[PDB]
Amino acid sequence: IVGGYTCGANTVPYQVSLNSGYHFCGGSLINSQWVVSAAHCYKSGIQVRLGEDNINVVEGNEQFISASKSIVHPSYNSNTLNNDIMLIKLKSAASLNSRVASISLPTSCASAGTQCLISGWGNTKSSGTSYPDVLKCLKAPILSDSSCKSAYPGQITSNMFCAGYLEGGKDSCQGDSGGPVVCSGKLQGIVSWGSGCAQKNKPGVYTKVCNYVSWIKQTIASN
Ligand SMILES: N=C(N)c1ccc(O)c(Oc2cc(C(=O)O)cc(Oc3cccc(-c4ncc[nH]4)c3)n2)c1
Ligand SMILES: [Ca+2]
Ligand SMILES: [Ca+2]
C-alpha cells in the first residue's frame, strides 16, 4: 500500500497473511474455515496467519493454520487475470474473537464513487521498494468502468473494477495481492493487478467479488 496509513493492530480483523516461509499474499476470512484470495497467489504448502499486525513479531493474538484444500476458480486465466479468485479451506476452524473476524459477502455490486478500505503488507513505495512489517490501510473510491477501461484498453473484463485515484500517489502494490477491498461492510474486491503502483492514470485493478457469490457459496457448501 502506497500513501496509506498504519491501520492499528487488529482494526481489520478479517485480514489474513498467506505464508510459505514468508508473507507472499493477503486474503480475507469469510467464515471460521474459509479464506478468499486471488488465484494468482496459488501455491502449494500455504499457512494462513490470522490476527496479525506486525508479521515479523509474535504479538500474542495470532492463529497459524495450515490449508487443507485450495480451489482456484474453474475459469481463471493466468494470462489475462480474468476470474482472479481462489478459496482456501483451513485444516481446523479459526477461533473468532475481537481480533479475528469474518467479513460478509455482498448481496449486490457497489456503485462507482463508493468509498472502500484496502489493506495489506505490500510495498509502500511508488517506484522503489520498502516493505512494512505492520498492516497498512487505504481509503479509495471505486472508479467508473469507463475510466478503468480507458487506462487499460482491451484488458478489463466484466469481472474486474478499478479503485483508486487517477492522479496517482495512493494505491495497492506488490505484496498486497489477494487482500480485501471492503465497501459498506461487504467484501467487494480482491487486490489483483496494476501497472506500477500509485502511477498517474494507472489505478489498481480488483476482482469483482459480487459476480462470484453463488460460486463461493456453492463451493464452500460442497467441500
Ligand atoms: N498498482 C497496483 N494496484 C498493483 C496491485 C498488485 C500488484 O501485484 C502490482 O504490481 C504489479 C507488478 C507486476 C510485475 O512486476 O510484473 C505485475 C502486476 O500485474 C500484472 C501481473 C501479471 C499479469 C498482468 C496483466 N495481464 C493482462 C492484464 N494484466 C498484470 N502488478 C500493482
Ligand atoms: Ca504492532
Ligand atoms: Ca505478528
Side-chain angles (χ1 to χ4, degrees), residues 1-90 92-223:
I1 307 279
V2 184
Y5 60 96
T6 309
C7 303
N10 319 106
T11 282
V12 198
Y14 52 80
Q15 172 85 228
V16 129
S17 172
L18 307 185
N19 184 289
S20 57
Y22 48 89
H23 164 91
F24 68 93
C25 276
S28 297
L29 190 76
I30 63 170
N31 76 35
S32 72
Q33 318 197 43
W34 294 93
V35 166
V36 188
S37 177
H40 80 263
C41 288
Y42 167 83
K43 188 173 303 224
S44 220
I46 287 176
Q47 180 186 67
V48 177
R49 306 186 151 204
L50 308 96
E52 281 291 13
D53 185 37
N54 184 321
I55 51 158
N56 276 324
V57 175
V58 176
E59 300 172 294
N61 306 303
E62 306 88 349
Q63 306 173 37
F64 299 162
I65 306 170
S66 274
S68 52
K69 207 175 212 188
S70 288
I71 312 155
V72 168
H73 194 272
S75 311
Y76 171 62
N77 180 323
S78 62
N79 289 194
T80 66
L81 289 198
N82 191 26
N83 305 111
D84 193 11
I85 183 172
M86 137 185 102
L87 292 167
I88 307 170
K89 194 177 188 188
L90 298 179
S92 58
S95 297
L96 307 177
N97 53 60
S98 52
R99 280 132 294 138
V100 179
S102 65
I103 184 73
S104 16
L105 295 183
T107 59
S108 68
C109 303
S111 287
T114 299
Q115 210 73 207
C116 302
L117 178 71
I118 308 161
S119 53
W121 289 276
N123 184 15
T124 66
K125 305 304 200 152
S126 193
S127 228
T129 298
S130 187
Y131 285 80
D133 292 316
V134 298
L135 195 61
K136 290 305 178 176
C137 285
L138 168 74
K139 294 168 88 290
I142 292 176
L143 300 184
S144 73
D145 279 332
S146 89
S147 334
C148 192
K149 290 169 174 168
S150 294
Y152 308 102
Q155 333 217 268
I156 304 300
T157 72
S158 66
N159 295 319
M160 298 172 191
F161 72 84
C162 291
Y165 303 87
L166 292 191
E167 59 267 26
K170 299 186 185 160
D171 197 357
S172 46
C173 197
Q174 332 232 9
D176 290 319
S177 275
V181 179
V182 165
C183 323
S184 305
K186 304 300 192 172
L187 181 71
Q188 288 288 8
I190 302 161
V191 181
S192 180
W193 60 277
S195 175
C197 308
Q199 296 276 220
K200 168 187 77 291
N201 299 305
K202 291 308 177 227
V205 186
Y206 302 86
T207 309
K208 200 177 171 160
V209 179
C210 66
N211 288 354
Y212 297 101
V213 178
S214 34
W215 174 72
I216 299 171
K217 288 167 108 212
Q218 282 127 234
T219 300
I220 264 74
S222 308
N223 286 278

